[PDB]
């Protein structure tokens, strides 16, 4: 009948022991999944038109400028893919949809702040609990065995991706800040009306139409940006340099997948399918995968023609 | 930068642009959708009781990086067809008129300095 936490009754001689034990267990579980192709992987199929592959869960670090060989500057957002894994697979018939579904988790958190059901679900999977879980729609030939890690090499430079995340919330806001209403002038006899919306409806209806723009809570909702390309990939740190800005604050979790735009469909022929497997790879990837237009930092000063 | 009723400085050697009272012409219309004139835009001036089209070459408002910022809002007069009224420009002007799309070769040829 009384609430409790993990270290309520633990003594001074036992708190560090528990902390180090759970930390070492989490590290061991994370390291034990680094060889997916040796732990009886699911069959790998060649790429086919009309196939959709799984995405990633990244963390928004920040932004930095990046110049092209044409001398144009573009801002790139750093998305760090850390502790991203596939959790479970659901068939098309069981999901009762047109496409099959796959679950992806990332950014491991403490086991002491999660529900019993989630803890026991992760116990059989043998991974520390993740912060967020997302669902991706894939085809039958894109299935990946559960527990398989994923890396930033899953994407390649020159590929267009879409990013969805919860935007920065602003709480309760007025019409001027929320819907861009112009308000009223500040002088010439105006009486306590400078940001007021003004008229709300017409006099005949005697009501307010549903969906009327009114003050209320703004932000903190899921938004998606489409048509963002990849300029650079850091393999050592598992970092994607996506073009432009992405929704959400710093150190937030963003779901990234291939672009759904019809103008960019059927561009995954050269992309890894169903994903990149460093353990079974014949060759080691370079430290940073650039784009053809990206001027590398080590490259000499660019001279135009 | 430059919009309606904004004083501008005429930089070429046009006799129309030469003001004996040291009065500055002010724009009355900007030939852009949003009415805000950046470098290379075309505006209209009410100068000496005449309405003359003009080409803005530099403005005080900040712009992109590596692009010069001038301490005065500069403009050069143009005719109704594109031939500049003046003959030469003394003050330096940005080279970005080359990159920008428009009828600028005459002004670049009659210009003296670049920044």
């Amino acid at each position: 009948k009384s609430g409790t936490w993990w270290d309520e009754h633990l003594s001074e001689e036992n708190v560090p022991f528990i902390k180090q034990l759970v930390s070492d267990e989490d590290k061991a579980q994370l390291a034990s999944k680094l060889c997916p192709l040796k732990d009886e992987p699911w069959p790998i199929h060649p790429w086919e038109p009309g196939s959709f592959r799984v995405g990633l869960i990244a963390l928004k670090l920040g932004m930095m400028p990046l110049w092209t060989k044409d001398g144009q500057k573009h801002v790139v957002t750093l998305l760090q893919v850390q502790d991203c894994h596939v959790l479970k697979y659901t068939s098309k018939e069981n999901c009762n949809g047109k496409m099959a579904t796959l679950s992806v988790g990332g950014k491991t958190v403490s086991r002491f702040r999660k529900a019993t059901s989630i803890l026991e679900f992760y116990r059989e999977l043998g991974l520390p609990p993740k912060q967020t879980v997302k669902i991706f729609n894939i085809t039958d030939n894109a299935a990946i065995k559960p527990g398989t890690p994923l890396y930033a090499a899953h994407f390649r430079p020159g590929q267009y991706v879409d990013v969805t995340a919860k935007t920065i919330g602003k709480g309760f806001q007025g019409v001027m800040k929320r819907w861009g209403f112009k308000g009223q002038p500040a002088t010439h006899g105006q009486t306590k009306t400078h940001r007021r919306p003004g008229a709300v409806a017409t006099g005949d209806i005697g009501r307010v139409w549903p969906g009327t723009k009114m003050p209320g809570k703004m932000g903190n909702i899921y938004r998606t940006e489409y048509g963002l390309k990849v300029w650079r990939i850091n393999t050592k740190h598992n970092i994607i340099y996506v073009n432009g800005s992405v929704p959400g604050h710093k150190n937030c979790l963003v779901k990234v997948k291939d672009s759904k735009l019809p103008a960019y469909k059927d561009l995954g022929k050269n992309l890894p399918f169903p994903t990149y497997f460093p353990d079974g790879d014949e060759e080691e990837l370079p430290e940073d995968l650039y784009d053809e237009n990206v001027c590398q930092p080590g490259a000499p000063s660019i001279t135009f023609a | 930068a430059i919009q309606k009723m904004t004083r501008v400085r005429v930089v070429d050697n046009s006799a129309l642009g030469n003001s004996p009272y040291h009065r500055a012409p002010r724009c009355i219309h900007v030939y852009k959708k949003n009415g805000v004139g950046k470098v290379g835009d075309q505006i209209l001036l009410a100068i000496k009781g005449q309405k003359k089209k003009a080409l803005i070459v530099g403005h005080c408002m900040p712009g992109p990086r590596m692009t010069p910022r001038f301490d005065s809002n500069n403009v050069v007069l143009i005719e109704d067809n594109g031939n500049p009224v003046g003959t030469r420009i003394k003050t330096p002007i940005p080279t970005s008129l080359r990159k920008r799309e428009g009828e600028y070769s005459k002004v670049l040829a009659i210009a003296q300095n670049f920044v």
Binding site: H9, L10, S11, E12, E13, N14, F17, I18, L21, G171 | -
Partner: protein, 154 residues
């Protein structure tokens, strides 16, 4: 929208906030232990912590001397600051103050906190202590730790 705002809005303005924090800090310096509303104590804790570092800077330092002169309204406390508190915490590198919550005052049911400098001469507060190592859960965890350690040694 207040994101990243670390300074609370208190008093009649910035000047009033600074003056209230200065008075609380002077009282804490003089008495080695005070009680005050929780928000004000939490705001004053940082200044209290940094004052000890400014004292460690040394009295001969002009900047430290001026800072102490500003932040101590009673001038008899500056020699105390530079000759008692700083030598006491000379060995330590942080955590010079401890703050605890106390029952709400009967006047207006405000949230009250008591803040004191460590090492004072006053009677010890009834500090909250974790469960003893001899309880059932601690004994079981200690047995687990011993077994794991001996297994690793073997």
């Amino acid at each position: 929208i207040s994101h990243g705002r670390v300074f609370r809005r208190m008093g009649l303005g910035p000047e009033s906030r600074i003056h209230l924090l200065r008075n609380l800090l002077t009282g804490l310096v003089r008495h080695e232990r005070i009680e005050a509303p929780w928000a004000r104590v939490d705001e004053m804790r940082g200044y209290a912590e940094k004052l000890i570092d400014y004292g460690k800077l040394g009295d001969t330092n002009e900047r430290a001397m001026r800072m102490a002169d500003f932040w101590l309204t009673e001038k008899d406390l500056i020699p105390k600051l530079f000759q008692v508190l700083a030598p006491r915490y000379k060995d330590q590198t942080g955590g010079y103050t401890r703050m605890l919550q106390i029952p709400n005052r009967s006047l207006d049911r405000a949230k009250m906190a008591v803040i004191e400098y460590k090492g004072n001469c006053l009677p010890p507060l009834p500090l909250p202590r974790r469960d003893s190592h001899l309880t059932l859960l601690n004994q079981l965890l200690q047995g687990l730790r011993q077994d794991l350690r001996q297994s690793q040694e073997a």
